Each structure stands twice: as structure tokens, then as C-alpha cells.
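Field guide to reading this record: the first block holds the primary sequence, the second block holds the structure written as C-alpha cells, and the final block holds curator observations. Each block starts with its own label. This record concerns Fibroblast growth factor-19, catalogued under organism Homo sapiens.

BLOCK 1 — SEQUENCE
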Amino acid sequence: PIRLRHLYTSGPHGLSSCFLRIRADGVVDCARGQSAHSLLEIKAVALRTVAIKGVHSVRYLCMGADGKMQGLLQYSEEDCAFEEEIRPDGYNVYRSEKHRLPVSLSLPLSHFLPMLPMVPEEP
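BLOCK 2 — STRUCTURE
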């Protein structure tokens, strides 16, 4: 099962707007608003486990050294499969078992709300 969403977070001071963006060059960063490279495919691999892929970069969201996120053309479940956990604020944490860390865009910037796209689209 697939959801097309944009993942939103903000920082500890609550001033920023950060949509997780997987760029064509593999950099993962923040965008202020929803854009083409922030549209993500969140695939429910099993139970609460997800794989997340940038629709337009066709890159998987993967965790590397120190928990630093990157976009890779090839999926590796150990680095790119996450446990999706709802939090009291209504946002999710995406936990990497291998890395023992949450997905974060720094932890700050680790609660992500899957927001619907402002316009419709098919996978």
C-alpha cells in the first residue's frame, strides 16, 4: 500500500516550516512549502514499517552515518526501512532499528506530519 504525502516538521523554537525534500542530487533538506521534490511515496512494507521514496528524484530516503539522511537510487532495507510511530502531537517518528535513531533533518526536526498534497496525483 502506498500513500503520496509531504512530510512536514518544524524546529525546537517552532519558527520554521520544513517539508522534507529529496533532491535529484541525493541531498535531503528542508523546503518552506510543498514542491515537486517534497512529494513522497510512503510504502507500507509491513505493519508499521515503511519505505519512503521521492517521487520526482526517484530516490529512497536512507539513513547514513551519524543518522544523516540522504537520497539513494537503490533501496537497502537496513538503512531505508523505518518504523512509523505516532506521537501525541499527531506527528510521526520514523525509527531506524539498525541506526537506533529517528529520521531527522537536524532530536530536533524528527517529528514529521504526513500532509496531503494540495493537488491530486496517481503513483
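BLOCK 3 — OBSERVATIONS
The first strand starts at residue 2 and ends at 9.
Helices lie at 77-80.
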